[model samples]
Target: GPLGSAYQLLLSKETLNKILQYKQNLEKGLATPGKFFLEELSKQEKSISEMDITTFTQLLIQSKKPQVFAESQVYHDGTDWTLEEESILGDVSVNMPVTMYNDGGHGSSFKNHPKPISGYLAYVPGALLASGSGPTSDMKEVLDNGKLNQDKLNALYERRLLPQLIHFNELARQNEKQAAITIPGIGTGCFSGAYYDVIKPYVRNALIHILEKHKDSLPYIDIIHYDPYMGDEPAEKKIGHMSFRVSPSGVVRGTTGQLDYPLGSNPDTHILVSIVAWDHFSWPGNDYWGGARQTDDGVKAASTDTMGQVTGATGVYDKKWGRYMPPESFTKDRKGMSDWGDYVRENGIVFNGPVLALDKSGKLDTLENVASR
Candidate 1:
């Protein structure tokens, strides 16, 4: 299972403890101990060794092969792209500290100095990690109380989320690949908001907007909502003002069915939406608030139930193959820190078969478009 692989590879309890202990020591003004930090990484190599190398290598090689499912689908703005041309782009969100001088920034204390950059988004002058920052509340409130202002959430959608989606595609265009962007349910944890109410709706609309504007250009989009409260059953579609449907096969569509085709007579595209559940205690903080937000107590709790309720929870695997499980280390251990890589492997991660799409009148169409409300 992918979850087991992660525990063996990157997210083991022993590994987490080492890293947490090192950070605490650094915060207490302790000197850099010889190889203490390096040793933590050494443990990763050992975990990698634990993987069934034969199966791991086989999947890696298989992922490199051509996709039968994606063949007819649009893989380019105008040009065709081979499997070699495709790549995964990771996204990160962060907030600034109120006054940087006193409360050290999100990472380690010693590396507190911000880099010299020319642009507004620059990590170092002229270089940027992300497109730009979103409208966020003071870091002090987020850190102290684990909540963000409700007003700030709206701004985050308008100023940051939408803009970043477009920018991510721009980056894909430059690199000559279709962007299969994977974003999480934003603002659910320390950032703010309830799962069904705020976070889900924001993601739903954002996906719609992205598809309406850049469907041809952006080939695919996947949203991973870690519903701590809803362990395994399909996440409720309480998002948006419209009624939508999620079939047992994983096709999601709205009751409005098919609207007048905006992009003309071109057949619609399909985007698979998966909802995975882990029945573990929901950890507070560290929902991309950065690693520093994770408390010692939270880590201790996570270690106790490494797989959470994912063992038999609903929707943990693809119904047809039953192989879509993520890493156990991720669900139980990393909790808020899980990323696209945690769930999707670099190679051999493939989706096959067709999910039937129907219009408002229950009329079937050749193409299954998830965004056509």
Candidate 2:
């Protein structure tokens, strides 16, 4: 295919390592799109060696035809990108690290970004390489019908999500700073119908898998899963809450609060799922709206050592798509970046998270955060 041909033309050892790894993964009885295409790619090279001039010229000509999916696969490696996704991101295989952004938005439409109130924009889904191919087909019935298929979810993590995260981490560390990798609850929130109870834990374990698996293997991966929910939402009626907690190098001895992920521990890293809210912070005990009180215990717990994020677990909860009329409740004060929201980000507080609205990429909305209607 085009990917293989371009890789060949580029002569990348990085691509070769990926091919090698894909082959190893296949031997382990795990299958990936990369494996099949790679196998086909190997056959292509071997066969090409035997074909004399004529067909070979035809093949070369065909390669010039419209080729897509090429720009996407380019390892985000450059003065800006990693230049090439390394065999081990952040390792000797790569000169610079690579970063991955989990585009959090409505699946039906990629453009549902730049939160109305906060004026935040959605990020480019970094994990969308052929890797974007999500959840195995067999699990389709269960997902559409709202059933939990643990094995399928776990398999997707091991094969799909985990591989991309390794790349995201490298990019982040290579561009190291306060925190480079920005993670979100992805499909688990708002627009998607993912059961909060199921998806939250799934996302957590995915973290445990990535964090533990890549311990000292790569450079420090400063990650911030910007949605805070202490695994406290009931199985029904889950809502949206964009939160943050920077795990620089603390030590995720185990799942922070009360949850225990299957993959177990991690290196010198920490994650804090702060169970908090906006309305709770504004009851006149402090007159008007003033985000979080730094002295508050719950707020204190969610805060990272370096203060990467100070957000509560609760925020805007859009219910059941739109019954008949609409969740114009969504439209009611939809774009209102409240006083508490103002105070929180302005003063660096927690609890006024997603509502306060700001993109991980630091992008702003083209439209104003106010309702014209």
Candidate 3:
């Protein structure tokens, strides 16, 4: 559905060119016509003026021509019928969650070695299980005190985590499916560490190491999911822009906040982002943002008489080369609610997109017992 909807809203090449022309006009301070965008759309000229300028700009800057598919699966009747399935479960990095293990007949004294105890889906698990150089504590205490204990984190990852991951991928590659690690911000969730910190210190750095060392030796590495705690909602909503760059030196860098990818660095390099679902709550000016009408106020104040100034320090109006503000009416309509997943499908170019849903019965269903990797 998101695919169909986005396709309906997709701009043709001619129309995209016209938007570029409009950008030129705005930069040059040329007289531009104020056509009723809604009316003009019925006539089908496909001018940039006929669309929300912000959305149009997002389409242009994040643009990558064509689409590609990498995988597919079967689902039905809340039952299992699928290809190979595997999962990388988590544990406390150093101090294991010894108490939780007890109810299942395991003990705190047990060793966290670099191997997986295979289950319904083969599992290559890791640990974030301890506090600093000391023993583990309750989950709440770990959060309240904010002790990530990177020494413990790195110890578990190097000794018990990375090896299991490499072995799992080897198995997957032998079975002919690239691995998709469903990783999370190691210290951010139950541990109460900041999301960015966990991503930077533990996750991203570890990934960069793996990519550089084993680019050719290992199977294709894909992080299929990055699980975020509900606590991340506020930070997620303020995503003014997001992009990442991959270098020939086996480096991949991701940038968020108000910054963007630098140009003229690597002619062979490009950047992209793909999201599975985006909700209205994620928009900048919506009720979900600081409980203020700030987005509307900004839009209304800048816009008048079919012209507006689009300039936010973040988001669509952020200052950049060839920026052109869209009509206020268009911006308002653009903010109106729609199925964002469908929007992403139509508007965003993604590779290896797959769908997974829980059954209506709500009994913890998977894509037929196989996680959508």
Candidate 4:
């Protein structure tokens, strides 16, 4: 959300022109008669200082990025509200937390990936999941470790996955206004059902309990039900759904490692969700990134080599563009990818979440699962 890595790539000749026009208009507004009100106020013997006079401009910037809200605090002089005390105002205000997945590799994983998995009506499904890219090879290996064949897996799908997805959905619908976007991962990724399946049911029910306390504001407040894992390719394609993609770049060459779709939504919208979710990562290796170091030397090389070009010195670092960033945010967390595929093939994406599985088993949940590839 705070000027992403692709910020430069986002600008084009037309965009540049539009930006120029916008700045020109803004500059003109700054010169308008109303703009001098702050200057005029300074001339008066009011307690407001010249430093306070700068509040006019501070308001506009803070309005756009409300995180700077401190810049526009109101000061009371008896009962009078001075111009300096007025905060900047803007229409179409949005309030969403930035979720981050801070694990090893990248100090903050959300920095690597910024895709939205929240559910809502009259909202944009947008484009974060893209075409191509299967789950990780290690994921496949782990699913096989579960030793569940196709038939056994399918039965689990029918008995376990279906019930779980439905249970989560019911909990969601039951608490309609406060429902979180409870979705199954389409394939293998961070929010795969294998993981969420274990976690969903309990979390949903728990959420319901929490929301009951605030029933008055349930329907009106924006209930961001984020799944984090919804588009796992392993299950989606097996069910005969053409995993959505406008362009195909093959497995490793194009976007096998990337998350989210190729479109215009990241900066203005999804960034907030991603920034917040990154905080949820429990471990450094939880994302399965270490596998990338083992699987494809080329990917490691390209990322390292290319990044060196921008960073100038080889060892210098910036939090904005740092190593350990996922080669791709959404799709790269394939630790349990093979298990996700198997889970889908046998259980399907419509099933329960990993949270449910956690409830069933009292042990700390691990990413490894059956039927990954």
Candidate 5:
């Protein structure tokens, strides 16, 4: 959320204006921000400092492309709180909020591709979100629905949920490394199923609100709509439906190569990632990544199922972008993603997660089960 002033420190005020002016030009042409970015690297001029790079990076990432956009399920309501990015651009007071940031959860395996994207990316269904540190925190567990009321959910978005989402893009922009660029823990998690009846309409409104207000700066996220929930109450209860985790040190040991995700590297050229579930540890047919899809060249796209469970994640990165996170934050450890899944139990997201096979081994405790292309 720092201003573009860092550029001024390294270069003259005149140079900063040209850089900002160049930002407007990049947005206007068929050429991309990444394309113009490369052009800059070729120039003798380089903004070497991390702060300058972050500020300039924000200029490149935050600008809206002509065609990139998002889709959402929406219904207007009396109590919905809505605002658009364009509407609030004049409000310099609207600084990007800091993420709860459990930690530098995973290093980005993504970098420049045809479309240019990073991955640690998860989709969000955040009509509301939790104040928890890591992805495993259940919205219901963190903010109990039974005891909670409507206005409290609204307050959270105004406070953390909405801003937290905006901050993801902020990371993409301000991150010198661009590896800091990812959207984490986007779904309602356990809260969706538990609070569906009470909160569904509000969630819809929230989705629609983001679409109207922030669609341009927003990344297209993948979500798995309506995948079957599996396993017994004991396993489900402990894992906390829609749970998963990531490891920095190594690929999770329990996983087969096909199933290895979140903690492991992507199998394909695409920089795809998973807010993975306890697939191998639990039921065989249990898969949820509704609507989310990535191409071999790193183009992120999504298709919404009948809207069962709305969750997903998508991110962007490039090595030349430099390091957004400091080196000390990354910790190599023994636990695997699957190990964490057994403990936390579910992988969560919002809006069109991923496309995978389905099964009824699960108790079928949800909505919109039909996954569609």
Candidate 6:
């Protein structure tokens, strides 16, 4: 009726006690002997055996091959039935942590990633792994390659790289049929808003075309968000005007100005496409600020921390999908590294369909390149 009773089996009091006891023994040896040891030991043997059984059962349930569980009964430690009762039943057991709740299911798509690359890339749907697998999905590797090749770029568009870029695309789409994704332009913008100013023009027009061409799938209109130095009056007024606040260091603080999501805010029809353009300086003390603005000279934070990110809740509220499309300029890599997009990608891991884009020269003619025409 269900697949892998691992959670149930492992959650038992006896099993818990057995594991806990094993841990206790391991820790005692480590502290007393002055040389920590967790290898095969006495009382630990039973615990290890129990763990093996659990792992075997888990492996079976997670396996897709039938040979993995041939000789079995009505139900095994690992099994799944297409029975109506099981399908429509309550108290279902989830095999993957990411597939448990709706959010969990979606998050699972972009779960695994290599450490060399920040956790950011792992959020991409293409980076999602097969439970035990690592983040080396076809989609992710392809996009990584595409960034360096024009043919690969074309292939990416043809094969739908943007859709696989993040895990929360569906939620974003459902939130706004024509959702315009946005991210911070280069770090936090409390001290300087120049980068955001420069990129808004490029990003805005592109989105306008996205909206005009796909009236049915228009993304949120992009806005040039300025995070000026803490004392700037216009920035303060703007925040106050929209009720969007800011901290003393020039960081934007608080939720969106809109109370209710736009009308037709359902899982299918998106109402708004919001794209925010911003920039910042990065200094360790100024993490409260955005980007690489230094409190003093000669200090640098890692790119992992500096990838530009816009704050606020992500994906869809209700049953819809929505997102912030940050311009590439807002992060530490004066070149606008894609690391910040990890937030978007991590959130989009659950989308099950390709992202539809109107061909250039159609109603969405913002991309004026001759190739598109």
Candidate ranking under TM-score, highest first, comes to 2, 3, 1, 5, 4, 6
Q: What's the lDDT of the predicted structure labeled candidate 6? A: 0.22
- lDDT (tens digit, per residue) of candidate 3 on 1-373: 1232111111122223344555556446662322222222334345555544433333232221111110111121112111111001121011000001000101121222122121111111222233332322222222335655444444334432343344444545554544433233333322332334453345434434444444554443332223332222211111112212222111222312011112321112321111111111022111112212112111211111001111111122212211113334434566453222222333442211121122222222223232222
- Please give, for residues 1-373, the per-residue lDDT of candidate 2 as tens digits: 1111110011112222443454445456663233223333344554533543222222322221111121222322221122122221111110111111111122221122122111011111111112123332223422546465555454434433333334434433544421223333433432123355566666555545545554444343333333333442312111121112422111332322211101222222322111111110121111113223222121221121111112221233222220011123322464355433343344444211111111122221111121111
Cα-based lDDT for every prediction: 0.25, 0.27, 0.25, 0.23, 0.25, 0.22
> What are the RMSDs of all candidates, in order?
21.9, 20.5, 23.6, 23.7, 20.9, 22.5
**Model 3, residue 351: what's the lDDT?**
16
TM-score of 3: 0.24
TM-score of each: 0.24, 0.28, 0.24, 0.21, 0.23, 0.20
Return the candidate ranking by lDDT, descending: 2, 3, 5, 1, 4, 6
Write model 6 residue lDDT over 1-373, tens digit each, in one string: 1111111111112222333343344446531211111111221334433443233222222222111111112121112321211111111111101110111111122111122121111111111111122222222322353332323323322222222212223334444433222122211222112223333233223323322333333223222122222333223222111212122222434322111122223324432222111111111112212222222110111111222222222211111211112343433343444332343344331111111222322221111121134
lDDT at position 129, candidate 2: 15
TM-score between candidate 5 and the true structure? 0.23
Candidate with more favorable, higher lDDT: 3 or 5: 3
Positional deviation of residue 274's Cα in model 5 after best superposition, in angstroms: 8.2
lDDT of 4: 0.23
Give the number of the best model, judged by lDDT: 2
Could you tell me the lDDT of residue 76 within candidate 5?
13
For each predicted model, how many residue pairs clash, with residues at least 3 apart or on different chains? 13, 20, 10, 55, 47, 55
Writing each residue's lDDT as its tens digit, candidate 5 over 1-373 gives 1111110001112222344444445446632333323443344354433224234433332331212111111111111111221111111111111111112222243222333223433322233232122221223323553544444454433322333234433444444322122222223333344444445445333333443444444442222121111110111111112122221122232322111223223323223332221110111102211111221101122111111111111211213331121111111232233221121124321111112111122111111131111
Best of the two (5, 6) by TM-score: 5
